[PDB]
Amino acid sequence: DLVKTLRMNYLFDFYQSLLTNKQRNYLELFYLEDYSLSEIADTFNVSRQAVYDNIRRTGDLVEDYEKKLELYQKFEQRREIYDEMKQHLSNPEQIQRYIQQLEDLE
Amino acid sequence: DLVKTLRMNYLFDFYQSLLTNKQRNYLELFYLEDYSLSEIADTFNVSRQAVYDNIRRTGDLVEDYEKKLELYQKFEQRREIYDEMKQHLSNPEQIQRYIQQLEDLE
């Protein structure tokens, strides 16, 4: 069900501005601050079920944004390309083809 | 206005997937295809006023997405750096600096 993964930290970083303050605060507490559902429920004095549905729904919204905008998938491929380019700084042909790949993934 | 029209044309490809079907179709017709409000209202058999209100909210929404995510601005900055790199393919130190510039953008 809910899993604290690297992916969720990145999706939040990319899409947090698109959320409401309440949606952001639920994900900040759970994923960024590593609170448990019970700790959040006690902080907001709401039921655990309520906390779970709020985090589940908001997480699904962020995944929906990623499917539409693909910012994390594009960032991941660019990061891989930058690392490879940093291994071929002295080869014009390699750099040229990596620039092409950076343009094509857009 | 002209400026809003130009902006909707630059920003549409980056954010159209976030819009509802109605928001997307009305924005396409008004800003990309130059239909009048009455023509759009007749095309979809709806209130000219509802169309005006929808387009007004949508135009503001799209500019707000660019203010928050900067996808068009960043795509164009990356485009310029890629083009600058193409002019220094034999300068290892310079290429390394451009990659640093790109990493600072993300």
From Swiss-Prot, chains A, B:
Family: Belongs to the UPF0122 family.
Record protein name field: UPF0122 protein SAV1236
Organism name: Staphylococcus aureus (strain Mu50 / ATCC 700699)
Gene3D superfamilies for the chain: Winged helix-like DNA-binding domain superfamily/Winged helix DNA-binding domain (1.10.10.10)
Lineage: superkingdom: Bacteria
PANTHER family associated with the record: UPF0122 PROTEIN CBO2450/CLC_2298, UPF0122 PROTEIN YLXM
Described function: Might take part in the signal recognition particle (SRP) pathway. This is inferred from the conservation of its genetic proximity to ftsY/ffh. May be a regulatory protein.
Pfam family for this entry, one: UPF0122
SUPFAM superfamilies the record matches: Sigma3 and sigma4 domains of RNA polymerase sigma factors (SSF88659)
